[PDB]
């Protein structure tokens, strides 16, 4: 599974011109260092492991951080489920237009115990219900609404102090891939929502405290970490140089192509 | 090891031991085969 | 020789004398949607030559100061023959486009065009808060020009350096790309197959890809050389299959 | 039941863990997979594919298109000066950091392989000239004379019909994996382009021709240690 | 004992988990199973079975029986107007949301398959007429003329002894699974019924005949992502 | 296990009239899109998975939420064990008249630490006894009564802060199926309790704190989640359009057949 | 995997891998066989 | 799921545990291993290799080079006195504690094996003399006469061309493993060097010759119980 | 026992049962073989 070994080369004066190619063809030259220059026989035990899209997405990264409190809509956290909320994994997922990945969510929830005048009352271990409402499903409006009855909606019901909750999610896109980039309008009139927001509507994630109330306000932070696995990247894209501005669109502020250097001949050190 | 303890296929470990690679999709997408040892024209 | 090329898709044919090898989109030749990969149960309308022909779009003058142009396909093919008619009269459509960009320049002309088919080139709004209308990115009649610098308003961010998608334009070669270098090339052909998550998608709401022609080296010609150097896109959908006959959408 | 002793790594969320987890929706019928062209099963494939690099990243030119343009001219002035010079390491070099190999390098901490820089002469068809594109391995000063660049690894680019010479940096390193982050120990060499011969042009052709450099990864190229990219900085919630 | 490392999914109550649990009453002799007719081993079976849909769900008529009744008449007036029109998607369309396929659709987030609408002419036995029941795939405006509906998928219903024509929507979608929730991307087509010919009746038969539409699922039909139904709202403890 | 593939079709002018059927027969037409219209050969890799009654009931949903306190009858929670208490799973179970399901109860219990004047005393980890009294068995009247001695009554004795308690229950109905719908009176005189209350008398669930007392009032909420598994649905029923009013009867307030639209021809968008 | 660690049959994982289906109970309950390619009468 | 009973050793970080843990970077391509000469697969190999010991560790001489130098002279004075004397146990003996075997001994609590002390005569080539290097097993007083040392294990070193006699302490112990820490029970013997004959030198050679003692481990040598070394003391953060 | 439950090679128990030893790298590094039963010279 290792990369191709550098074949031994020698002096050459021929008509092969391996270095001389044409980018006009659009084909990146398949040349090796043995072609242009003279190289020794180096057996490359180096392997393109951890560079696989499966391994690259294997690193779990946050996609959703929100603060929901105990003792309105601030007692539970609502997440329009998209990878684009957090820039760290968004740019990874935006390296490819289509990724057919089974996403492994690992919720990390930490209670904060908000600083108040009175904080001398100790609440028992806080259980957390991370319910997933599929798109078009019943969206709860209160922390005790009927939607929290998980007849069909999956829910971990994670309790604090245990191992972080983790529920692997299959490939749920209506299409055959998750369109991270989708230059398309929601409506056929070409008017509406432009971007990944249209196709990447995978429901919502409502996070609440299973505990009814606490003597003092406790604002637990739900840190959702998305680990893509069984990924099928299908159309590669460059990383977005510009910083992410909107989580529902690719809208960006202009950014330099690279870090500017003093001169075209400016080589530090 | 490689034993899958969950019935659902998605509920399995990532396929981190698969190192399949076909750079020819991107590096060599031309219809006519281009050999480095000949002029590209 | 590899420089000469001839593509006879449909009634219209394109013959070139200085054209490098055609860039098959991502190494896979376009084809009709197979029964294994088909999700629509309607009988596919497959005009072999009525729609799968070379459509010559509006030619745009490659000025010295031109930073780039983009066409949004297949919506750029509206009002272009029976391909556009089938777009209007069908809910779902699939096509593999062998775009052919013609830039006839003399041996004394300096310039280079990255003709790149970016699948799903989601364009960024000039003002990040709002979203541009459809007219700003759609390419029904004329190519939408990338601006040399940043622009503002309810339009598409046309900064050529960011390619309009917040992406390094020099890295746009990651997508199926061919270079029209007037030193060597005068025409680039990219045979891009149908590229989308869904096997068939509507051809109005969703643009299957965007053909971005980015002059990396601006056109440079001395006095006396032809100043009107045209960049003519001749795109031929291949293996075009449509499902869902419906009322014409306009 | 079964006596189980919890390891000291229990009840932890390691980010890079191959641990099976219960399915959110068991027996969920995933949408059937279709052969979408361009299946990326490794991002070293997108590193291998060419990418125009911003060689001329002088102040202001990064905003415009002239960042990639490598200016060459039919003038005797500054002919004994490099056409360009920059650091070979794609991780931290200003030219190569935001390119396809560099962007897929700053997502990692270690990189190994032969960077190949394809140089496209974007000038007049009758503009013929010879350049000397040289990778100098580290340990010495940046080449300030064309002879110094010739002493290192180099290729003479005779601009012609092909119009693209590939300078393949032959992985001249003292370690199996150079480090993407800027460190003098795994500091790479210096890629400098000079004039082996002037860019001779006919009277009807522009003297100020342009060159594009395409830094691409060879089959040797690999990255070993993943890391969050320094380029993608998120000031706050989007 | 056995070294066991707890995965980051330990000590969680995932709702959709296939985890074995200790029996409340071990070795409990369950009452012997009997062959009760109608064993439902999938709710797409109850989706497949016909269901009268409330096509005429105009205000007030949902309370009465006229919601399902599709009114047709032997009058020249409004003959160039649709007998009815509604959205094809059973998930959010008012007509099809509370029917058997729709009710077994809003319990899910994704749906795929061919809805088949069986139209029963509940009029006089001598009342003969030709209708044009048309599913128009999305991407265009709702059919406002019978020609526009004819341009899409359609079936001519010649009312006769059979008295029931099945308009089978042939799953004209750009994705393998349309989304049950109202989203323009997976928005379905429009099912419109028009008069291909008037409902000719003898002088002794009523002109205002009635039609019943039975939206049913075909063998293709499937749902992929389960979700709590929005219809069943519980204000409080019962 | 996938659904039937759409067979290829073509133009047809025959006497088969596949579209022309009769609903008077009571048989839903077995027609396919290839029958009425002309369709391409589409291999339907889509499968009727997650639509199985086994998978549909696999999603665990709440059936019983009650608040029982620490430091009368309010110190333990009494549940007449029925799926009908919570509407979310009730309508799922009411999709079928008879369901022979082994029910997997997963109790989720979260302490609340009721807001009081003094809450500065920290109680150790609260253990919770979820006892099941079979129908006709001894029903406790106090939190420390003799009934809590679980000589025969199953009890998890779950402790807070651990994994949520889960005790799978076999099929315990006296009949051969759980009659979710039972249009029958309790007594043969046709007078008494009408509905599922008669046959679906599966005992009671008493939830208490194993801890004798606490310095301050702690009202833990018992959230019982019922996951049916090994289900045998036997007589399908439509979902109840009307909102549930009573948990012991099907009594309902009249509700519209569907969401009313402006007109019979009113097609939004 | 599919190993049952509890003796009681009910104390086992849900049979989520069973996709048996007989719509003919509801869609085709008529005594006389009805073929779509013939008039229903 | 599977009934698992946690052992009383669960959720603990035992330092000496062979417990598998999830990989920080899964499928990480480690740099290919090269045959670097000198592969140490056991630190008893570095114990076995010779090491100059500070026999003459008198105050002040530990700072200088004279700690290793064992002074010998061509003088009748103090000829009936030991050339040196110290404790055999490398764990706590001042001479042998910081040597290769001793340094790899104080990293352990128990030690077993035959220490071999190679004595190199670093004097004039014509300086010939006979020494009596004697390991006396414990249980008796430190040898104060050459006869007492002769009564124990001893070797006569006839200084000549070889110039190095190896006094191999033949593991005279009452237990299979002596304890590295200073304890009288596993207290080792005493290694004392005396003059069997004077160091006769020609008139042109220095009388005050030097001897170097190389305490090395034999094939028998082993250490059994690891412990933090008392030598490496860290007062605070570096 | 010796079963590796993690795919990555580094994510395995320490090889504490390997007692391979070659002291000749350090104790006997001379080019010419030296036998103890002969003068070293
Ligand atoms: C708590 C159990 C259920 C968990 C469900 C939460 C995850 C829903 C599925 C996410 C799909 C992938 C992310 C959105 C699509 C994309 O932009 O790639
Ligand atoms: C704590 C261990 C014992 C658990 C016993 C609690 C569950 C009792 C059995 C419930 C049967 C199914 C629900 C009632 C019948 C129905 O309406 O379907």
- DSSP β-ladder status, C187-192 and C23-24: parallel
What sign has the CA pseudo-torsion E53, E57, E63, E64?
Answer: negative
Strands (E), chain D: 2-6, 70-72, 84-87, 110-112, 115-122, 130-136, 153-158, 164-168, 178-179, 190-195, 209-217, 222-223
Cα(F93) to centroid of ligand 2, in Å?
Answer: 13
- Pairing type for strands D190-195 and A98-99 reads unpaired
Neighbours of chain C (3+ CB pairs under 8 A): A, B, D, E, F
Q: After which residues is chain H broken (C to N over 2.5 A)?
A: none
Interfacial residues of E (vs B; Cβ cutoff 8 Å): 18
How many angstroms separate the CA atoms of G13 and E23, rounded? 11
Mutate which of G1, G2, G5 to test chain H, going by most H C-beta atoms within 10 A? G5
Q: Map tokens 């019922």 to a residue.
A: F226
Mode of pairing for the β-strands spanning D153-158 and C230-245: unpaired
Q: G touches A (3+ CB pairs < 8 Å)?
A: no
Closest CA to D180 of D85, D116, D115, D234: D115
Torsion sign over Cα D7, D12, D17, D19:
positive
Give the distance (Å) from ligand 2 centre to CA of residue F109. Answer: 17
Q: In angstroms, how far is CA A179 from the centroid of its own chain?
A: 13
Strand partners, H71: H210
Alpha-carbon span A195 to C166, nearest angstrom: 13
| Structure's resolution in angstroms | 3.3
- Residue of chain I whose alpha carbon sits nearest to that of D17: I6
Of F39, F43, F46, the CB nearest to C43: F39
Q: Are D97 and D90 in contact (CB under 8 A)?
A: yes
Closest CA to D82 of D67, D72, D97, D92: D72
From chain B, the residues in CB contact with I4 under 8 A are: 1
Contact between C20 and C177 under an 8 Å Cβ cutoff? The reply is no
The residues spanned by each domain of chain F are: 1-269
Question: Structural domain boundaries of chain I?
Answer: 1-41
The Cα–Cα gap between B25 and D39 comes to: 8
**Could you tell me what percentage of chain F is helix, strand and coil, using 3-state DSSP and rounding each to the nearest 5?**
10, 30, 60
Comparing C-alpha atoms, which of C17, C55, C221, C32 is closest to residue C139?
A: C55
Taking an 8 Å cut-off on Cβ atoms, the answer to whether F56 and A152 are in contact is yes
The tokens describing E32, both together, are 């012997």
Does the CB atom of residue F97 touch ligand 2 within 6 A? Answer: no
User: Across-strand partners of D116?
Assistant: D168, D216
Residue C107's nearest CA partner among D44, H50, D128 is D128
Rounded CA separation C54/C80 (Å): 10
- Other C-beta atoms closer than 10 Å to the C-beta of G1 total 8
Residues 6+ apart with CB under 8 A from E212: E52, E68, E69, E70, E119, E120, E122, F23
CA of F85 from ligand 2 middle (Å) equals 12
Min Cα separation A54/chain B (Å): 6
At residue H86, what are phi and psi to the nearest 5 degrees? -160, 175
Beta carbon of F81 within 6 Å of any ligand 2 atom: yes
Q: Give the separation between CA C157 and CA A122, rounded to whole angstroms.
A: 53
F231, F57 Cβ separation under 8 angstroms: yes
CB-CB contact of F50 with F56 (8 Å): yes
Q: Which residues of F touch G39 (CB under 8 A)?
A: 17, 20
Q: Is the CB of A199 under 6 A from ligand 1?
A: no
- Please tell me the distance from the alpha carbon of residue F125 to that of residue C82, in angstroms, as a whole number: 74
The rounded distance, in Å, linking the Cα atoms of C151 and D234 is 23
Q: How far is CA D212 from CA C218, D53, D85, D114, in A?
A: 12, 7, 14, 19
Q: Which residue of F has its CA nearest to D32?
A: F45
Cα(F27)–Cα(F31) distance, integer angstroms = 11
Helices (H), chain E: 44-48, 100-103, 146-151
At which residue do the structure tokens 């009425």 appear?
A: F36
- Residue among F78, F202, F249 whose CB has most ligand 2 atoms within 8 A, to mutate: F202
Please report where in the chains the tokens 């160039």 appear, as a residue.
E80
Flag whether residue C2 sits within 8 Å of chain B, measured between CB atoms.
Answer: yes
With beta carbons less than 8 A apart as the criterion, state whether F245 and E232 touch.
no
- Tell me phi and psi for residue H98, to 5 degrees: -100, 10
Which residue of chain C is at minimal alpha-carbon distance from A175?
A: C198
How many cross-chain Cβ pairs, C to F, lie less than 8 Å apart? 34
Atom from ligand 1 closest to the CA of residue A178: 18
- Ligand 2 pocket check for F205: Cβ under 6 Å: yes
C-alpha distances (whole Å) from F230 to each of E18, E108, E238, F52, F56 are: 12, 21, 28, 11, 11
Question: Rounded to whole angstroms, what are the CA distances from C10 to B13, C28, C82, C90, E30?
Answer: 49, 20, 12, 20, 71
Q: Please provide the DSSP assignment of H145-165 as one string.
A: SHHHHHHSEEEEEE-SSS-EE
The string of DSSP codes covering F149-168 is: S-SSS-B--EETTSSPEEEE
CB of A81 shorter than 6 A to ligand 1: yes
Residue A82 CB–ligand 1 contact under 6 Å: yes
Looking at chain B from residue 1 to 20, which residues have their Cβ under 8 Å from any Cβ of chain G?
3-5, 7-8
* A154 CB within 6 A, ligand 1: yes
Which of F136, G5, F105, F64 minimizes the C-alpha distance to E24?
F105
What domains, with CATH codes, occur in chain C? 5-245 (2.60.120.20)
State the residue for tokens 């009313």.
F260
Instruction: Tell how strand E190-195 and strand A204-209 pair up.
Output: unpaired
Experimental method used, please? cryo-EM
Please report, for residues A266, C179, H238, the alpha-carbon distance to residue D58 in angstroms, rounded to integers and kept in the order given: 9, 25, 43
Element (H, E) at A14: none
Please say whether the beta carbons of E165 and E155 come within 8 A: yes
């Amino acid at each position: 599974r290792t990369v191709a070994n550098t074949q031994p080369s020698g002096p050459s004066n021929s008509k092969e011109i391996p270095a001389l190619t044409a980018v006009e063809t659009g084909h990146t030259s398949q040349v090796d260092p043995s072609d242009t220059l003279q190289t020794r026989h180096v057996v490359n035990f180096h392997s393109r492991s951890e560079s696989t899209v499966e391994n690259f997405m294997g690193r779990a990264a946050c996609v959703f951080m929100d603060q929901y409190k105990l003792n309105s809509t601030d007692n539970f956290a609502v997440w329009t489920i998209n990878v684009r909320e957090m820039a760290q994994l968004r740019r990874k997922c935006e390296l490819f237009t289509y990724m057919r990945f089974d996403i492994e969510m690992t919720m990390v929830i930490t209670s904060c115990q908000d600083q108040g005048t009175q904080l001398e009352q100790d609440m028992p271990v806080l259980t957390h219900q991370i319910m997933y409402v599929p798109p078009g499903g019943p969206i709860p409006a209160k922390v005790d609404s009927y939607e929290w009855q998980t007849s069909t909606n999956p829910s971990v019901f994670w309790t604090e102090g245990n191992a972080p909750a983790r529920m692997s999610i299959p490939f749920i896109s209506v299409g055959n891939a998750y369109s991270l980039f989708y230059d398309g309008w929601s409506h056929f009139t070409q008017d509406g929502t432009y971007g990944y927001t249209t196709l990447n509507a995978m429901g919502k994630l409502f996070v609440r405290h299973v505990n009814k109330s606490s003597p003092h306000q406790i604002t637990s932070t739900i840190r959702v970490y998305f680990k893509p696995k069984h990924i099928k990247a299908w159309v590669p894209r460059p990383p977005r140089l510009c910083p992410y501005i909107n989580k529902g669109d690719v809208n960006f502020v202009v950014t330099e192509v690279t870090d500017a250097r003093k001169s075209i001949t400016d080589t530090p050190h | 090891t490689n034993i899958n303890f969950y019935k659902d296929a998605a509920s399995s470990a990532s396929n981190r031991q698969e190192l399949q690679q076909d750079p020819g999709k991107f590096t060599d997408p031309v219809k006519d085969l281009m050999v480095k040892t000949l002029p590209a024209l | 020789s590899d420089r000469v090329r001839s593509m006879t898709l449909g009634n219209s044919t394109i013959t070139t004398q200085e054209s490098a090898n055609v860039v098959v989109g991502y190494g896979e030749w376009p084809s009709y949607l197979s029964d294994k990969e088909a999700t629509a149960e309607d009988q596919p309308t497959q005009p072999d030559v009525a729609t799968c022909r070379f459509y010559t779009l509006e030619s745009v003058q490659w000025e010295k100061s031109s930073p780039g142009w983009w066409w949004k396909f297949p919506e750029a093919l509206k009002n272009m023959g029976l391909f556009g008619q089938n777009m209007h009269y069908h809910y779902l459509g699939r096509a593999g486009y062998t775009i052919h960009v013609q830039c006839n320049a003399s041996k004394f002309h300096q310039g280079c065009l990255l003709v790149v088919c970016v699948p799903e080139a989601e364009m960024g709004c000039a003002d990040t808060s709002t979203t541009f209308p459809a007219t700003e990115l759609t390419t029904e009649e004329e190519p939408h020009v990338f601006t040399s610098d940043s622009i503002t308003g309810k339009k598409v961010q046309a900064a050529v350096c960011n390619a309009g998608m917040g992406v390094g334009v020099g890295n746009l070669t990651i997508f199926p790309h061919q270079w029209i270098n007037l030193r060597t090339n005068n025409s680039a052909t990219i045979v891009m197959p149908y590229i989308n998550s869904v096997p068939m998608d509507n051809m109005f709401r969703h643009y299957n890809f965007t053909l971005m022609i980015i002059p990396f080296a601006p056109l440079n010609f001395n006095e006396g050389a032809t100043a009107y150097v045209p960049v003519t896109v001749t795109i031929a959908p291949m293996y075009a299959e449509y499902n869902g006959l419906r009322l014409a959408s306009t | 039941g079964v006596p189980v002793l919890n390891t000291p790594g229990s009840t932890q969320f390691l980010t890079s863990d191959d641990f099976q987890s219960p399915s959110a929706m068991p027996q969920f019928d995933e949408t059937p997979e279709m052969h979408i062209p361009g299946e990326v099963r490794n991002l070293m494939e997108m590193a291998e594919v060419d990418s125009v690099v911003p060689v001329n990243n002088i102040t202001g030119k990064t905003k415009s298109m002239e960042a990639y343009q490598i200016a060459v001219g039919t003038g005797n002035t500054d002919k004994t000066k490099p056409i360009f010079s920059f650091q070979m390491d794609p991780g931290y070099s200003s030219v190569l950091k935001r390119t396809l190999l560099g962007e897929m390098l700053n997502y990692y901490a270690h990189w190994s392989g032969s960077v190949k820089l394809t140089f496209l002469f974007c000038g007049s068809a009758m503009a013929t000239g010879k350049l000397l594109i040289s990778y100098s391995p580290p340990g010495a000063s940046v080449p300030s004379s064309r002879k110094d660049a010739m002493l290192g690894t180099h290729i003479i680019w005779d601009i012609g019909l092909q119009s693209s010479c590939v300078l393949c940096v032959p992985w001249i390193s003292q370690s199996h994996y150079r480090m993407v982050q800027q460190d003098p120990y795994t500091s790479a060499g210096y890629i400098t382009c000079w004039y082996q011969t002037n860019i001779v042009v006919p009277p009807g052709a522009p003297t100020s021709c342009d060159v594009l450099c395409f830094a691409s990864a060879c089959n040797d190229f690999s990255v070993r240690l993943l890391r969050d990219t320094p380029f993608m900085a998120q000031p706050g919630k989007l």
